[PDB]
Coordinates of C-alpha atoms and ligand atoms in Angstrom, one line a residue:
Chain A
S1 CA 0.0 0.0 0.0
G2 CA 0.9 3.7 -0.5
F3 CA 1.5 5.8 -3.6
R4 CA 4.6 7.9 -4.0
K5 CA 6.2 9.9 -6.8
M6 CA 9.1 7.4 -7.2
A7 CA 12.3 7.9 -9.1
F8 CA 14.5 5.1 -10.5
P9 CA 17.7 4.3 -8.4
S10 CA 20.3 6.7 -9.8
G11 CA 23.5 4.6 -9.2
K12 CA 24.0 3.5 -12.9
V13 CA 23.8 7.2 -14.0
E14 CA 26.0 8.7 -11.1
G15 CA 28.9 6.6 -12.4
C16 CA 28.6 8.4 -15.8
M17 CA 28.5 12.1 -14.7
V18 CA 31.6 14.2 -15.5
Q19 CA 32.4 18.0 -15.5
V20 CA 33.1 19.7 -18.8
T21 CA 35.0 23.0 -18.9
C22 CA 35.5 25.1 -22.0
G23 CA 37.1 28.5 -21.3
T24 CA 35.1 30.1 -18.4
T25 CA 32.0 27.8 -18.8
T26 CA 31.6 24.7 -16.7
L27 CA 28.7 22.2 -17.1
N28 CA 27.8 18.4 -16.9
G29 CA 28.7 15.7 -19.3
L30 CA 27.5 12.1 -19.7
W31 CA 30.5 9.7 -20.1
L32 CA 29.4 6.5 -21.9
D33 CA 32.1 4.1 -23.3
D34 CA 34.8 6.5 -24.8
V35 CA 32.4 9.5 -25.5
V36 CA 31.3 12.4 -23.3
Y37 CA 28.0 14.0 -24.3
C38 CA 27.2 17.5 -23.2
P39 CA 25.2 20.6 -24.5
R40 CA 27.0 22.3 -27.4
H41 CA 26.4 25.8 -25.7
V42 CA 29.5 25.0 -23.5
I43 CA 31.5 26.5 -26.4
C44 CA 29.6 29.9 -26.4
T45 CA 30.9 33.2 -25.2
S46 CA 28.8 35.5 -22.8
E47 CA 28.3 37.7 -25.9
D48 CA 27.6 34.8 -28.5
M49 CA 24.4 33.7 -26.7
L50 CA 21.9 35.6 -28.9
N51 CA 22.8 34.3 -32.4
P52 CA 25.7 31.7 -32.0
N53 CA 27.1 30.1 -35.1
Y54 CA 28.1 26.8 -33.5
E55 CA 29.9 25.4 -36.6
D56 CA 32.0 28.6 -36.7
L57 CA 32.7 28.4 -32.9
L58 CA 33.6 24.7 -33.0
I59 CA 36.0 24.9 -36.0
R60 CA 38.1 27.3 -33.8
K61 CA 38.4 24.7 -31.0
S62 CA 41.1 22.1 -30.5
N63 CA 40.8 19.0 -28.3
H64 CA 43.0 20.5 -25.5
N65 CA 40.5 23.4 -25.2
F66 CA 37.9 21.0 -23.6
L67 CA 38.8 20.0 -20.0
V68 CA 36.9 16.9 -18.9
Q69 CA 37.0 15.8 -15.2
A70 CA 35.8 12.5 -13.9
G71 CA 36.0 12.7 -10.1
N72 CA 39.5 13.8 -9.3
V73 CA 40.9 12.5 -12.7
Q74 CA 41.4 14.5 -15.8
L75 CA 40.2 12.7 -19.0
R76 CA 42.1 13.4 -22.3
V77 CA 40.0 14.6 -25.2
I78 CA 41.2 13.0 -28.5
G79 CA 38.3 14.1 -30.8
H80 CA 35.2 16.2 -31.0
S81 CA 32.1 16.4 -33.2
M82 CA 28.6 18.0 -33.0
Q83 CA 25.4 16.2 -33.6
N84 CA 22.4 18.6 -33.6
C85 CA 22.6 20.5 -30.2
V86 CA 24.9 18.0 -28.5
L87 CA 28.7 18.0 -28.4
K88 CA 30.4 14.6 -28.5
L89 CA 33.9 14.5 -27.0
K90 CA 35.9 11.4 -27.8
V91 CA 38.0 10.6 -24.8
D92 CA 41.1 8.3 -24.4
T93 CA 39.5 6.1 -21.7
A94 CA 36.3 4.1 -21.8
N95 CA 34.1 4.5 -18.7
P96 CA 34.5 1.3 -16.7
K97 CA 31.2 2.1 -15.0
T98 CA 29.3 2.3 -18.3
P99 CA 25.9 0.6 -17.8
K100 CA 23.9 -1.3 -20.5
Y101 CA 22.1 1.7 -22.2
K102 CA 20.0 3.0 -25.1
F103 CA 19.1 6.5 -26.3
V104 CA 15.3 6.9 -26.6
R105 CA 13.2 9.9 -27.7
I106 CA 10.1 10.2 -25.5
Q107 CA 6.6 11.6 -26.3
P108 CA 4.8 14.3 -24.2
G109 CA 3.1 12.6 -21.1
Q110 CA 6.0 10.2 -20.6
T111 CA 7.8 10.3 -17.2
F112 CA 11.5 9.9 -16.3
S113 CA 13.9 10.4 -13.5
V114 CA 16.3 13.4 -13.4
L115 CA 19.7 13.2 -11.8
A116 CA 20.4 16.9 -11.1
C117 CA 24.2 17.7 -11.1
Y118 CA 26.5 20.6 -10.6
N119 CA 30.2 20.4 -11.6
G120 CA 29.9 16.8 -12.6
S121 CA 28.6 15.9 -9.0
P122 CA 25.1 14.5 -8.5
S123 CA 23.1 16.4 -5.9
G124 CA 19.6 14.9 -6.2
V125 CA 17.1 12.7 -8.0
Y126 CA 13.5 13.5 -8.8
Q127 CA 10.7 12.2 -11.0
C128 CA 9.0 14.3 -13.6
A129 CA 7.0 14.3 -16.9
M130 CA 7.5 15.7 -20.4
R131 CA 4.6 18.3 -20.5
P132 CA 2.3 18.5 -23.5
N133 CA 4.1 21.8 -24.3
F134 CA 7.5 19.9 -24.4
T135 CA 8.8 21.6 -21.3
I136 CA 9.6 19.9 -18.0
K137 CA 8.8 21.4 -14.6
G138 CA 12.2 20.6 -13.0
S139 CA 14.3 22.0 -10.2
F140 CA 17.4 23.4 -11.7
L141 CA 19.9 26.2 -10.9
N142 CA 22.8 27.7 -12.9
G143 CA 25.4 24.9 -13.7
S144 CA 22.8 22.1 -14.0
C145 CA 23.1 22.1 -17.8
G146 CA 24.0 18.6 -19.0
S147 CA 22.0 16.9 -16.2
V148 CA 20.1 13.9 -17.6
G149 CA 16.7 12.3 -17.6
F150 CA 16.4 8.5 -17.7
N151 CA 14.3 5.3 -17.1
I152 CA 15.7 2.0 -15.9
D153 CA 13.4 -0.7 -17.1
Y154 CA 15.0 -4.0 -16.2
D155 CA 18.9 -3.6 -16.1
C156 CA 19.1 -1.2 -19.1
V157 CA 19.3 2.6 -18.7
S158 CA 17.3 4.5 -21.4
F159 CA 18.6 8.1 -21.6
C160 CA 15.8 10.4 -22.8
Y161 CA 16.7 13.9 -21.8
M162 CA 19.6 16.3 -21.4
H163 CA 19.0 19.7 -19.8
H164 CA 19.9 22.8 -21.8
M165 CA 18.1 25.8 -20.5
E166 CA 15.5 27.6 -18.3
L167 CA 12.7 29.5 -19.9
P168 CA 11.4 32.9 -18.4
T169 CA 8.5 31.1 -16.6
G170 CA 10.8 28.9 -14.6
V171 CA 10.2 25.8 -16.7
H172 CA 13.0 23.8 -18.5
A173 CA 13.9 22.9 -22.0
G174 CA 16.3 20.3 -23.3
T175 CA 17.1 17.7 -26.0
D176 CA 17.1 13.9 -26.5
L177 CA 20.6 12.3 -26.4
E178 CA 21.0 12.8 -30.2
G179 CA 20.8 16.6 -29.6
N180 CA 17.2 17.2 -31.0
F181 CA 15.2 19.6 -28.8
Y182 CA 11.9 18.7 -27.4
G183 CA 9.5 21.5 -28.5
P184 CA 10.0 24.5 -30.7
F185 CA 13.1 25.7 -28.7
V186 CA 16.6 26.7 -29.8
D187 CA 19.8 27.0 -27.8
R188 CA 19.9 30.8 -28.2
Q189 CA 19.1 33.5 -25.6
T190 CA 16.4 34.9 -28.0
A191 CA 12.9 35.6 -26.7
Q192 CA 11.4 32.1 -26.3
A193 CA 8.3 31.1 -24.4
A194 CA 6.6 27.9 -23.5
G195 CA 3.2 27.3 -25.2
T196 CA 0.0 27.1 -23.1
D197 CA 0.3 23.9 -21.0
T198 CA -2.4 21.3 -20.6
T199 CA -3.2 18.4 -18.2
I200 CA -2.1 14.9 -19.3
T201 CA -5.6 13.2 -19.3
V202 CA -4.4 9.6 -19.7
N203 CA -2.1 10.1 -16.7
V204 CA -4.9 11.5 -14.5
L205 CA -7.1 8.5 -15.4
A206 CA -4.2 6.1 -14.5
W207 CA -3.8 7.9 -11.2
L208 CA -7.6 7.5 -10.5
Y209 CA -7.2 3.7 -11.2
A210 CA -4.2 3.7 -8.7
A211 CA -6.5 5.3 -6.1
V212 CA -9.1 2.6 -6.7
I213 CA -6.4 -0.1 -6.4
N214 CA -5.4 1.4 -3.1
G215 CA -9.0 1.2 -1.8
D216 CA -10.5 4.6 -2.6
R217 CA -13.7 4.9 -4.5
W218 CA -15.5 8.0 -3.2
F219 CA -15.2 9.8 -6.7
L220 CA -16.8 7.0 -8.8
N221 CA -20.4 7.6 -10.1
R222 CA -23.1 5.6 -11.9
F223 CA -22.5 7.4 -15.2
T224 CA -20.6 6.6 -18.4
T225 CA -19.7 8.9 -21.3
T226 CA -18.9 8.7 -25.0
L227 CA -15.2 9.5 -25.9
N228 CA -16.4 12.5 -27.9
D229 CA -18.5 13.9 -25.0
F230 CA -15.6 13.4 -22.6
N231 CA -13.2 15.3 -24.9
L232 CA -15.8 18.2 -25.4
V233 CA -15.8 18.6 -21.6
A234 CA -12.0 17.9 -21.0
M235 CA -11.0 20.6 -23.5
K236 CA -12.9 23.3 -21.4
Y237 CA -10.6 22.5 -18.4
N238 CA -7.4 22.6 -20.4
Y239 CA -7.1 18.8 -20.5
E240 CA -5.4 17.0 -23.4
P241 CA -7.7 15.1 -25.8
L242 CA -8.0 11.4 -24.8
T243 CA -7.4 9.3 -27.9
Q244 CA -8.5 5.7 -28.6
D245 CA -4.8 4.8 -28.1
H246 CA -5.1 6.1 -24.5
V247 CA -8.3 4.0 -24.0
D248 CA -6.5 0.9 -25.2
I249 CA -3.5 1.6 -22.9
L250 CA -5.8 1.9 -19.9
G251 CA -7.3 -1.6 -20.7
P252 CA -5.2 -3.6 -18.2
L253 CA -6.1 -1.2 -15.2
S254 CA -9.7 -1.3 -16.3
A255 CA -9.7 -5.1 -16.3
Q256 CA -8.0 -5.2 -12.9
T257 CA -10.4 -2.8 -11.1
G258 CA -13.6 -3.7 -13.0
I259 CA -14.2 -0.1 -14.0
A260 CA -14.5 0.6 -17.8
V261 CA -12.3 3.4 -19.2
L262 CA -15.3 5.5 -20.2
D263 CA -16.9 5.0 -16.7
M264 CA -13.6 6.3 -15.2
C265 CA -13.8 9.2 -17.7
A266 CA -17.3 10.0 -16.3
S267 CA -15.8 10.2 -12.7
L268 CA -13.1 12.6 -14.1
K269 CA -15.8 14.8 -15.7
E270 CA -17.6 15.0 -12.4
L271 CA -14.4 15.7 -10.5
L272 CA -13.6 18.6 -12.9
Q273 CA -17.1 20.0 -12.3
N274 CA -17.3 19.5 -8.5
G275 CA -13.8 19.8 -7.2
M276 CA -12.7 17.6 -4.3
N277 CA -15.0 19.1 -1.6
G278 CA -12.3 19.0 1.2
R279 CA -11.4 15.4 0.3
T280 CA -8.1 14.0 -1.1
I281 CA -7.1 11.3 -3.5
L282 CA -3.9 9.5 -2.7
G283 CA -2.9 12.3 -0.3
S284 CA -3.4 15.0 -2.9
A285 CA -6.0 17.8 -3.2
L286 CA -5.3 18.3 -7.0
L287 CA -5.7 15.8 -9.9
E288 CA -2.2 14.4 -10.4
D289 CA -0.9 13.9 -14.1
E290 CA 2.8 12.9 -13.7
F291 CA 2.2 9.1 -13.3
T292 CA 1.7 7.1 -16.6
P293 CA -0.4 3.9 -16.9
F294 CA 2.9 2.0 -17.0
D295 CA 4.1 3.7 -13.7
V296 CA 0.9 2.7 -11.9
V297 CA 1.1 -0.9 -12.9
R298 CA 4.8 -1.0 -11.9
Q299 CA 4.3 0.7 -8.5
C300 CA 0.8 -0.6 -7.5
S301 CA 0.0 -4.2 -6.5
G302 CA -1.7 -6.7 -8.8
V303 CA -4.5 -7.2 -6.3
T304 CA -7.1 -4.4 -5.8
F305 CA -8.0 -3.5 -2.2
Chain B
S1 CA 13.8 27.7 -10.5
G2 CA 11.5 24.8 -9.6
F3 CA 10.8 22.9 -6.4
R4 CA 10.6 19.1 -6.4
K5 CA 10.5 16.4 -3.7
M6 CA 14.1 15.4 -4.2
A7 CA 15.9 12.3 -2.9
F8 CA 19.6 11.8 -2.3
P9 CA 21.5 10.0 -5.1
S10 CA 21.1 6.2 -4.2
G11 CA 24.3 4.7 -5.8
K12 CA 26.2 4.4 -2.5
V13 CA 23.3 2.4 -1.0
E14 CA 22.5 0.3 -4.1
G15 CA 26.0 -1.3 -3.8
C16 CA 24.9 -2.6 -0.3
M17 CA 21.6 -4.3 -1.0
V18 CA 21.4 -8.1 -0.8
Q19 CA 18.6 -10.7 -0.7
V20 CA 18.2 -12.7 2.5
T21 CA 16.2 -16.0 2.5
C22 CA 15.3 -18.1 5.5
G23 CA 13.0 -21.0 4.9
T24 CA 10.2 -19.7 2.8
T25 CA 10.7 -16.0 3.6
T26 CA 12.7 -13.7 1.3
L27 CA 13.5 -10.1 2.2
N28 CA 16.3 -7.4 1.8
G29 CA 19.5 -7.0 3.7
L30 CA 22.1 -4.2 4.0
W31 CA 25.7 -5.5 3.5
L32 CA 28.2 -3.3 5.2
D33 CA 31.8 -4.6 5.7
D34 CA 31.4 -8.3 6.7
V35 CA 27.9 -8.0 8.2
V36 CA 24.4 -8.2 6.6
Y37 CA 21.7 -6.4 8.6
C38 CA 18.0 -7.4 8.1
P39 CA 14.7 -7.5 10.1
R40 CA 14.7 -10.3 12.6
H41 CA 11.2 -11.4 11.5
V42 CA 12.9 -13.2 8.5
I43 CA 13.2 -16.2 11.0
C44 CA 9.4 -16.3 11.5
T45 CA 6.8 -18.3 9.4
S46 CA 2.9 -17.6 9.5
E47 CA 2.6 -19.5 12.9
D48 CA 5.8 -17.9 14.4
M49 CA 4.6 -14.3 13.7
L50 CA 1.6 -14.7 16.1
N51 CA 3.6 -15.0 19.4
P52 CA 7.4 -14.9 18.5
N53 CA 10.1 -15.7 21.0
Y54 CA 12.9 -14.6 18.7
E55 CA 15.8 -16.0 20.9
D56 CA 14.0 -19.4 20.9
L57 CA 13.6 -19.2 17.1
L58 CA 17.2 -18.1 16.5
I59 CA 18.9 -20.7 18.7
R60 CA 17.3 -23.4 16.4
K61 CA 18.9 -21.8 13.3
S62 CA 22.3 -22.7 11.9
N63 CA 24.4 -20.4 9.6
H64 CA 23.6 -22.5 6.5
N65 CA 19.9 -21.9 7.0
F66 CA 20.4 -18.2 6.0
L67 CA 20.8 -17.8 2.2
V68 CA 22.4 -14.5 1.3
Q69 CA 22.6 -13.4 -2.3
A70 CA 24.6 -10.4 -3.5
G71 CA 23.7 -10.0 -7.2
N72 CA 24.4 -13.5 -8.8
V73 CA 26.9 -14.4 -6.0
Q74 CA 26.0 -16.4 -2.9
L75 CA 27.6 -15.1 0.3
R76 CA 28.6 -17.5 3.0
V77 CA 27.1 -16.9 6.5
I78 CA 29.7 -17.7 9.2
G79 CA 27.9 -16.2 12.3
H80 CA 24.6 -14.7 13.5
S81 CA 23.4 -12.5 16.3
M82 CA 20.4 -10.3 17.2
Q83 CA 20.4 -6.7 18.3
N84 CA 16.9 -5.5 19.3
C85 CA 14.7 -6.1 16.2
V86 CA 17.6 -6.5 13.7
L87 CA 19.4 -9.7 12.7
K88 CA 23.2 -9.4 12.0
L89 CA 24.6 -12.0 9.7
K90 CA 28.4 -12.3 9.8
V91 CA 29.5 -13.2 6.2
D92 CA 32.9 -14.4 4.9
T93 CA 33.4 -11.5 2.5
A94 CA 33.6 -7.8 3.3
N95 CA 31.5 -5.7 0.8
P96 CA 34.1 -4.0 -1.5
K97 CA 31.4 -1.3 -2.3
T98 CA 31.0 -0.4 1.4
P99 CA 30.7 3.4 1.6
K100 CA 31.8 5.7 4.5
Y101 CA 28.8 5.4 6.9
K102 CA 27.2 6.0 10.3
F103 CA 24.0 4.6 11.9
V104 CA 21.9 7.5 13.2
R105 CA 18.5 7.7 14.9
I106 CA 16.4 10.5 13.5
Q107 CA 13.6 12.6 15.2
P108 CA 10.0 13.0 14.0
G109 CA 9.9 15.8 11.3
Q110 CA 13.3 14.8 9.9
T111 CA 13.4 13.6 6.2
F112 CA 15.3 10.9 4.5
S113 CA 15.5 9.0 1.2
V114 CA 14.2 5.5 0.9
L115 CA 15.7 2.9 -1.5
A116 CA 12.7 0.5 -2.0
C117 CA 14.0 -3.1 -2.9
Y118 CA 12.5 -6.4 -3.7
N119 CA 14.7 -9.6 -3.7
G120 CA 17.8 -7.5 -3.0
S121 CA 17.2 -5.5 -6.1
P122 CA 16.6 -1.7 -5.9
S123 CA 13.5 -0.6 -7.7
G124 CA 12.9 3.0 -6.7
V125 CA 14.0 5.9 -4.6
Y126 CA 11.7 8.4 -2.9
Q127 CA 11.9 11.1 -0.3
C128 CA 9.8 11.0 2.9
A129 CA 9.5 12.2 6.5
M130 CA 9.3 10.5 9.9
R131 CA 5.8 11.6 10.9
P132 CA 5.2 12.9 14.5
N133 CA 3.3 9.6 15.1
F134 CA 6.5 7.7 14.1
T135 CA 5.1 6.2 11.0
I136 CA 6.3 6.9 7.4
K137 CA 3.8 7.3 4.5
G138 CA 5.9 5.2 2.1
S139 CA 5.2 3.1 -0.9
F140 CA 5.9 -0.6 -0.2
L141 CA 4.6 -4.0 -1.3
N142 CA 5.2 -7.5 0.1
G143 CA 8.9 -8.3 -0.1
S144 CA 10.0 -4.7 0.6
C145 CA 11.0 -5.5 4.2
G146 CA 14.7 -4.6 4.8
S147 CA 14.6 -1.6 2.4
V148 CA 16.5 1.3 4.0
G149 CA 16.2 5.1 4.7
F150 CA 19.3 7.3 4.6
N151 CA 20.7 10.8 4.2
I152 CA 24.1 11.8 2.8
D153 CA 26.5 14.3 4.4
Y154 CA 29.4 15.1 2.0
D155 CA 30.6 11.5 1.2
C156 CA 29.2 9.8 4.4
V157 CA 25.9 7.8 4.3
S158 CA 23.9 8.1 7.5
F159 CA 21.5 5.0 7.7
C160 CA 18.5 5.9 9.7
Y161 CA 15.7 3.5 8.8
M162 CA 15.0 -0.2 8.0
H163 CA 11.5 -1.2 6.8
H164 CA 9.7 -3.9 8.9
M165 CA 5.9 -3.6 8.4
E166 CA 2.7 -2.1 7.1
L167 CA 0.0 -0.9 9.5
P168 CA -3.8 -1.4 8.6
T169 CA -4.1 2.3 7.4
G170 CA -1.5 1.7 4.7
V171 CA 1.3 3.6 6.6
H172 CA 4.7 2.0 7.4
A173 CA 6.7 1.1 10.6
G174 CA 10.4 0.3 11.0
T175 CA 13.5 0.6 13.1
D176 CA 16.8 2.5 13.2
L177 CA 19.9 0.3 12.1
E178 CA 20.4 -0.7 15.8
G179 CA 16.9 -2.5 15.7
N180 CA 15.0 0.0 17.9
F181 CA 11.5 0.8 16.5
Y182 CA 10.4 4.3 15.8
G183 CA 7.1 4.5 17.6
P184 CA 5.2 2.2 19.9
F185 CA 5.3 -0.8 17.5
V186 CA 6.4 -4.4 17.8
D187 CA 7.4 -6.9 15.1
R188 CA 4.6 -9.4 15.1
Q189 CA 1.1 -9.9 13.7
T190 CA -1.2 -8.3 16.3
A191 CA -3.6 -5.3 16.7
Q192 CA -1.4 -2.3 16.2
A193 CA -2.5 1.2 15.0
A194 CA -0.8 4.5 14.2
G195 CA -1.7 7.2 16.6
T196 CA -3.4 10.5 15.5
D197 CA -1.0 12.3 13.2
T198 CA -0.1 16.0 13.3
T199 CA 1.4 18.5 10.7
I200 CA 5.2 19.3 11.0
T201 CA 4.9 23.1 11.5
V202 CA 8.6 24.0 11.1
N203 CA 8.6 22.1 7.8
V204 CA 5.4 23.9 6.5
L205 CA 7.1 27.3 7.3
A206 CA 10.3 26.2 5.5
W207 CA 8.2 25.3 2.4
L208 CA 6.5 28.7 2.6
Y209 CA 10.0 30.3 2.5
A210 CA 10.8 28.0 -0.5
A211 CA 7.7 29.4 -2.2
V212 CA 8.8 33.0 -1.5
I213 CA 12.3 32.3 -3.0
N214 CA 10.6 30.8 -6.1
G215 CA 8.4 34.0 -6.6
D216 CA 5.1 33.0 -4.8
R217 CA 4.1 35.8 -2.4
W218 CA 0.3 36.0 -2.6
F219 CA 0.0 34.6 1.0
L220 CA 2.2 37.2 2.7
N221 CA 0.5 39.9 4.8
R222 CA 1.7 42.9 6.8
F223 CA 1.0 41.1 10.1
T224 CA 3.0 39.5 12.8
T225 CA 2.1 37.2 15.9
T226 CA 3.6 36.1 19.2
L227 CA 4.8 32.5 19.4
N228 CA 2.3 31.9 22.2
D229 CA -0.7 33.1 20.0
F230 CA 0.5 31.1 17.1
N231 CA 0.9 27.9 19.2
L232 CA -2.8 28.3 20.4
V233 CA -3.9 28.5 16.7
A234 CA -1.6 25.6 15.6
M235 CA -2.9 23.3 18.4
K236 CA -6.5 23.9 17.1
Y237 CA -5.5 22.6 13.6
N238 CA -3.5 19.5 14.6
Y239 CA -0.2 21.2 14.0
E240 CA 2.9 20.4 16.0
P241 CA 4.0 23.1 18.5
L242 CA 6.6 25.5 17.1
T243 CA 9.5 25.9 19.6
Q244 CA 12.1 28.7 19.9
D245 CA 14.6 26.1 18.4
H246 CA 12.4 25.9 15.2
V247 CA 12.4 29.8 15.1
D248 CA 16.2 29.8 15.4
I249 CA 16.6 27.1 12.7
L250 CA 14.4 29.2 10.3
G251 CA 16.8 32.2 10.8
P252 CA 18.8 31.9 7.6
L253 CA 15.6 31.6 5.4
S254 CA 14.1 34.6 7.3
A255 CA 17.3 36.7 6.6
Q256 CA 17.4 35.7 2.9
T257 CA 13.7 36.5 2.2
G258 CA 13.3 39.5 4.6
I259 CA 10.3 37.9 6.2
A260 CA 10.6 37.4 10.0
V261 CA 9.6 33.8 11.2
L262 CA 6.7 35.2 13.3
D263 CA 5.7 37.3 10.2
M264 CA 5.5 34.0 8.2
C265 CA 3.5 32.4 11.1
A266 CA 0.8 35.1 10.7
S267 CA 0.6 34.0 7.0
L268 CA 0.3 30.3 8.1
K269 CA -2.4 31.4 10.6
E270 CA -4.5 33.1 7.9
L271 CA -4.0 30.0 5.6
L272 CA -5.3 27.7 8.4
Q273 CA -8.3 29.9 9.2
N274 CA -9.3 30.9 5.6
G275 CA -7.7 28.2 3.2
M276 CA -6.1 28.7 -0.2
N277 CA -9.2 30.2 -2.0
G278 CA -8.7 28.3 -5.2
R279 CA -4.9 29.2 -5.3
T280 CA -1.8 27.0 -5.1
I281 CA 1.6 27.3 -3.5
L282 CA 4.5 25.5 -5.4
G283 CA 1.9 23.6 -7.5
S284 CA 0.1 22.3 -4.4
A285 CA -3.4 22.9 -2.9
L286 CA -2.3 21.6 0.5
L287 CA 0.3 22.9 3.0
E288 CA 3.4 20.6 2.4
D289 CA 5.3 19.4 5.5
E290 CA 7.9 17.0 4.2
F291 CA 10.7 19.5 3.4
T292 CA 12.8 20.5 6.4
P293 CA 14.5 24.0 6.7
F294 CA 17.8 22.2 5.6
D295 CA 16.2 20.6 2.6
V296 CA 15.0 24.0 1.4
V297 CA 18.4 25.6 1.8
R298 CA 20.1 22.6 0.1
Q299 CA 17.7 22.5 -2.9
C300 CA 17.8 26.3 -3.3
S301 CA 21.7 26.3 -3.3
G302 CA 22.8 23.2 -5.2
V303 CA 24.9 21.1 -2.7
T304 CA 26.5 18.0 -4.3
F305 CA 27.6 14.4 -3.3
Ligands
R2X1 O1 21.2 31.3 -18.1 C1 22.4 30.9 -18.3 N1 22.7 29.8 -19.1 C2 21.8 28.8 -19.6 C3 20.6 28.5 -18.6 O2 19.4 28.8 -19.0 N2 20.9 27.9 -17.5 C4 20.1 27.4 -16.5 C5 19.5 26.1 -16.6 N3 18.6 25.6 -15.7 C6 18.2 26.4 -14.7 C7 18.8 27.7 -14.5 C8 18.4 28.5 -13.4 C9 18.9 29.8 -13.2 C10 19.8 30.3 -14.1 C11 20.2 29.5 -15.2 C12 19.7 28.2 -15.4 C13 21.3 29.2 -21.0 C14 20.8 30.4 -21.3 C15 20.4 30.7 -22.6 C16 20.6 29.7 -23.6 C17 21.1 28.5 -23.3 CL1 21.2 27.2 -24.5 C18 21.4 28.2 -22.0 C19 23.6 31.7 -17.8 C20 23.8 33.0 -18.5 C21 24.7 32.6 -19.7 C22 25.6 31.5 -19.0 C23 26.0 30.4 -20.0 O3 25.3 29.4 -20.1 N4 27.1 30.6 -20.7 C24 27.4 29.7 -21.9 C25 28.8 30.1 -22.3 C26 29.0 31.6 -21.8 C27 28.2 31.6 -20.5 O4 24.8 31.0 -17.9
CL2 CL1 7.3 7.8 -25.0

């Protein structure tokens, strides 16, 4: 019993964090095999930030300009290349702590663990979700650039995010491990803003099924809804449309609890209309959207209370 | 910017988790140097858990009855002893991954990271607080017994909790690493209940200072209060008394934000008497009490490990 926002154990990722210094800029790198991956903006000047020409800045750099530190050991850079917004530094030593890994690009609504680092030193781990507007609501300060997002399903680490910047609203933007940004963002200090954010409907439904599994049913009602009527209502509360894919994905939780997806959609419609009335669901007074259907099945029991 | 429930990096603790099997019972052990620590109830079956005389049950066991597995390697048990509610299994191999560590007993209100494990395999890390009623609101399933709670100070791991059981309300009970329970609990199947819980006042105040630091000031007012008048109000809402020690501990956050501790108490008083009025603080519609004043300073400063 119980339901917590749970992050993956960070040990396999801690053994990969290094510090990357270029001139006066220091940030974090991810050392996998003989390559260190970091944001390419590590080569920028405090002037260059508005309209940097990264190809022009990189051609002027030599291997010995990049200082890479793994703990108290200096790694030797023997090559460098740029792939989209990520810099790849070839080093002379393969990381002996390299876990089994994959690089995965995630879709909005997906969750992951963030190992927040400063100066190549891990300081904390938290769980978060890729928002529908492609931003993440993280907890990052100056020097956190290069910190990574990951999932550890079985013994393989799937790297899905690398932190690049903070937007004026306090939210964060970054890339996958191939250097492609999530969202319409660029690694430039030009006026950029996060689009209007919405609630991840499929995740709120999964969380309502987690509450039922943990023995709470106060919010259920005798009603059902069509998918179209549910979406007409959901849109008015800034909720993402629920697709037939989402309904299919909620199938296992629906079979376990005995509550049809469209009957759970009717409870959600009623919750959005009535509020909570001084009550909580899984210790929360708001509808939680940062637990996917997969997270609920992984964390919750296979037997409903 | 951002404020997340953040756990310590779990790597130093993951290298200590082992699986302990005794008869038909499997649970988690903590391997430090040549000793494996685990709940003593591992020596109890479904009949032995009703009225357990642990010395009588232990005297009947031999070293080869305890199966200890570290990854895919079987450790050899060469001795066994009991200290309070924890079993200490002497093994033939010192753990080469043993970090610098201390065993510490924490007080209610203090926070720690939990590395939840099943079959000696870490599955998740979350942050939580020792409630004033000595329970923890964790997330645990069958097989989680022996999972540990910890904090990190520089490079030293301070082990403060070992999971033993779940109470009928879904909350959890356990011991320090010397086998002394937190709270009036015993390790056996019998009628046990968590006492009435209270809110950790010093932690709510720290979280209000974290909200101010992150740009959330709607709840501030021009008013102040005496500690005596605040404690009368707090007692009416099931809030723990605020002592002069708590006021002294909030000193740094008070100096940084420019809001006196008793000035912040007048805000908390108005929030208790009038509510949030449809508004949120740090993305929450409830007053959050699982961040200590130290956690706030650490997360809003970037301390690394
Ligand atoms: O804000 C800065 N850097 C980036 C950034 O956004 N970093 C941060 C990330 N997360 C949380 C943060 C919280 C508070 C302050 C910063 C945070 C940034 C800005 C613009 C574009 C990009 Cl791609 C990256 C400052 C100012 C320029 C300096 C910097 O990155 N330099 C590169 C080389 C010459 C100096 O550091
Ligand atoms: Cl995905």
